[PDB]
Amino acid sequence: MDCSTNISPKQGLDKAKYFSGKWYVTHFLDKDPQVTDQYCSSFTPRESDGTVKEALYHYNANKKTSFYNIGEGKLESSGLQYTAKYKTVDKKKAVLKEADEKNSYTLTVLEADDSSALVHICVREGSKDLGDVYTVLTHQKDAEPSAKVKSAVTQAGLQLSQFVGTKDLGCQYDDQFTSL
Ligand code: HEM
């Protein structure tokens, strides 16, 4: 499995629109058929002087379990795109594993407006691409994605109907974790 290659950030994006509020994933497209569990995700990205920090949450909708991470990376010279190393943490942000040199993710912002975003995430370990996920985001749980972001899906060469919608998954969020 190789992460999707036709990936670079949309030029002209206002970073203040992306690094704002919090995001909830309303739709995701995970390329790997062997990932049968479905997830919900929410995260709160912030940037200062080209360094991105973000508290990240996953909910496994089948097992009904949640896991927590803090990513830290540098903005690329290309725009709204960054490769993050990450801590693994508990719900209180106590560190279980510090960031390391072999585990990372690369997030690329493909569209972002006042209400909504389309981002791509490649999770890697060493020489290996572990996960490839496109996510449509909104600022509130089950809010409708913007027309501009729906266009961006099509612009990315994708079909929104092929994504998994998170509304029907029985998502549970931890809004205290993502606040900050
Ligand atoms: C609903 C959208 C998403 C789904 C379906 C999804 C799916 C997954 C799955 C299946 C795993 C592997 C879990 C395991 O077996 O340990 C995972 C891990 C991971 N995801 Fe996501 N993900 C989502 C959103 C995101 C977001 C938005 C980010 C970053 C902003 C992200 C970053 C990561 C990272 C860093 C890992 C590795 C965590 C670890 O190894 O402990 N994912 N994701």
Swiss-Prot record:
Result after altering V25E: Reverses orientation of heme cofactor
Classification lineage: Eukaryota, Metazoa, Ecdysozoa, Arthropoda, Hexapoda
Pfam families: Nitrophorin (PF02087)
GO cellular component, one term: extracellular region
Disulfide bonds: C3-C122, C40-C171
Protein name: Nitrophorin-2
Residues annotated as binding heme: H58
Organism name: Rhodnius prolixus
Keyword Metal-binding part of the UniProt annotation: yes
